[PDB]
Write a protein that binds this ligand. Sequence first.
Ligand SMILES: Nc1ncnc2c1ncn2[C@@H]1O[C@H](COP(=O)(O)OP(=O)(O)CP(=O)(O)O)[C@@H](O)[C@H]1O
Ligand SMILES: Nc1ncnc2c1ncn2[C@@H]1O[C@H](COP(=O)(O)OP(=O)(O)CP(=O)(O)O)[C@@H](O)[C@H]1O
Ligand SMILES: CC(C)(CO)[C@@H](O)C(=O)NCCC(=O)O
Ligand SMILES: CC(C)(CO)[C@@H](O)C(=O)NCCC(=O)O
Ligand code: NA
Ligand code: NA
Ligand code: NA
Ligand code: NA
Lengths: 307, 307
Amino acid sequence: EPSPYVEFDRRQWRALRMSTPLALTEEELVGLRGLGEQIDLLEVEEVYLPLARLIHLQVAARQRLFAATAEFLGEPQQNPDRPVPFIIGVAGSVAVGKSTTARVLQALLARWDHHPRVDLVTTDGFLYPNAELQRRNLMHRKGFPESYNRRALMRFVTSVKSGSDYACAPVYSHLHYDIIPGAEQVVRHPDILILEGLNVLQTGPTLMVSDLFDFSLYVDARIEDIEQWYVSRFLAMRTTAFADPESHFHHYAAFSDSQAVVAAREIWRTINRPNLVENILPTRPRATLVLRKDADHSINRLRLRKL
Amino acid sequence: EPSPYVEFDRRQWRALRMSTPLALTEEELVGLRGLGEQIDLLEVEEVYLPLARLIHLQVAARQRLFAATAEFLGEPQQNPDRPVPFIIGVAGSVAVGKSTTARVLQALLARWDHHPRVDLVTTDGFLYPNAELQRRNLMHRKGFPESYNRRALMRFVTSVKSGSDYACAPVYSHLHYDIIPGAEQVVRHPDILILEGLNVLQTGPTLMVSDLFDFSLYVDARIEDIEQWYVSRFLAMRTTAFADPESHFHHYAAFSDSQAVVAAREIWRTINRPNLVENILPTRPRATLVLRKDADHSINRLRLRKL
Ligand SMILES: Nc1ncnc2c1ncn2[C@@H]1O[C@H](COP(=O)(O)OP(=O)(O)CP(=O)(O)O)[C@@H](O)[C@H]1O
Ligand SMILES: Nc1ncnc2c1ncn2[C@@H]1O[C@H](COP(=O)(O)OP(=O)(O)CP(=O)(O)O)[C@@H](O)[C@H]1O
Ligand SMILES: CC(C)(CO)[C@@H](O)C(=O)NCCC(=O)O
Ligand SMILES: CC(C)(CO)[C@@H](O)C(=O)NCCC(=O)O
Ligand code: NA
Ligand code: NA
Ligand code: NA
Ligand code: NA
């Protein structure tokens, strides 16, 4: 029975690296790695390099589709210094390492021969501010689709891919756990734009940012492993993020291992796990490429959409 | 404010015809026109010709995307006699003329220089048989998403676009209003496949046929106009389709105008209108091109997705 997908073990995927250069050192990789992630240079060569290759191939191909529609339209033939921004979506659960995935990806692509402008934007800045969330009774639903200003987000991406000189996104503060008044992230006609979020692959009764993605990535892992990574991260943050007196969750720092685990599980069970099962996972079927992470965090299986 | 869409009046769209040949006569056009449709050769030149042009441009462009993924994969470079079938989805409400639209489209594309194999398949054959619908209490829901064997339909399209030598679809009988035992429609690696249906543009928690569309068409019109066209068609069929003694609805033939109108409105209000409003219309935002039909049935406005 035919399928729109084709599986790959790390062995078969790495082969597709061909002669792709590794323009990243250990120090740099470290500056991209997130707390808990085990990503090393080897994984960057066997997994992220074939990926950067596939993407640069598609960035060329996909360039025709916009050219053809330009020809048909009798429009002047597209300006070289301003191509149509290639949009890459990176989705997945909280604590699955998708942000490291996104950061690494940004680093690699930025280091491609002609050095393309490659921006990275997370959906955090599109979260409604706490005051607005309380108003909507969503202070315990940060992460769910309804906790974001989806129109604003769609506006942003639409603006960047339609060729605007600049588009701005609000900025979120994890330290203060809320939108930062007046903060803007400015994106200026990048060549590649990576949008990272939880449900960015969602589809619906209106055109959404997923309909604008030229390529999508979904960082996947067994649910029980993700919970472990989540709890583990929570405990570790008692001495990093929560240690800061300025942290909204500074009082989590004095928790004991037991208390920490209990609190992390509650948060996971009441927010993150439901959001993963009801909203995030249902979108995995449409991802161009799925990166499967084993319990040890390593990518040992990939799924690609050939259709 | 930027947009993923660009509007067109008949005047601006026809200009895009360029030097496209009209390989269709009146007799032929007639043999494609449905009861109630006002389509003439002029509309075929001003609306369907620019469309056939745009499509053949995209069929070339879109060919790269599959080539690039073939290159990346180190796969042998695609066989010329067997390209990747281009999939066109045609959606819209019952009685909006989308089938005529599909038939005309098939005729034009089949008449393109190198004469490509262009098949047309409606989703009717994927409807569950009456016995199965009764079992599910859906005998008054033919047309709704749940009245079709969506897995089968997805299997069919997946098979055709994955390059199978042949794929078969069940056949529906409008005369007998049910699936025809043993009837199969065989599709053999066509170059272009047009899938026509009511909710074929729907998206969901699994990869669906809309995710495989390389181009989609949505035939639109004001809801009140569609109801008129629907009722009008119902009355006219008292002397065509319902006139046949073998017709499942043969007893509608003896209805008076008044009785006919009452019955048609009930059917429209209880089945077709709800299905249009809850399921069909919500999918319009993703259509590549929307053909707007005025009350007189003429296409005087078009909406194209540039993003
Ligand atoms: N609770 C938090 N505190 C501080 N920074 C956070 C954060 N959650 C996310 N971030 C930012 O996003 C990055 C995510 O890195 P990583 O890929 O290792 O985890 P993740 O994004 O898969 C799970 P998360 O939903 O917690 O971000 C963090 O390194 C930091 O840059
Ligand atoms: N009730 C019916 N009786 C006979 N044929 C029908 C039919 N409904 C659909 N068909 C077939 O599909 C064609 C549809 O033609 P047209 O484009 O004019 O209407 P339509 O498809 O937009 C509304 P419908 O949902 O009734 O098919 C009919 O001409 C016939 O070939
Ligand atoms: C689980 C950690 C430490 C890491 O993901 C972090 O996401 C966290 O605890 N944040 C505050 C509670 C929450 O995750 O909603
Ligand atoms: C309205 C007509 C005549 C034409 O669409 C036809 O669709 C019809 O009446 N069919 C049987 C009832 C129904 O439309 O469900
Ligand atoms: Na920038
Ligand atoms: Na496809
Ligand atoms: Na055929
Ligand atoms: Na697009």
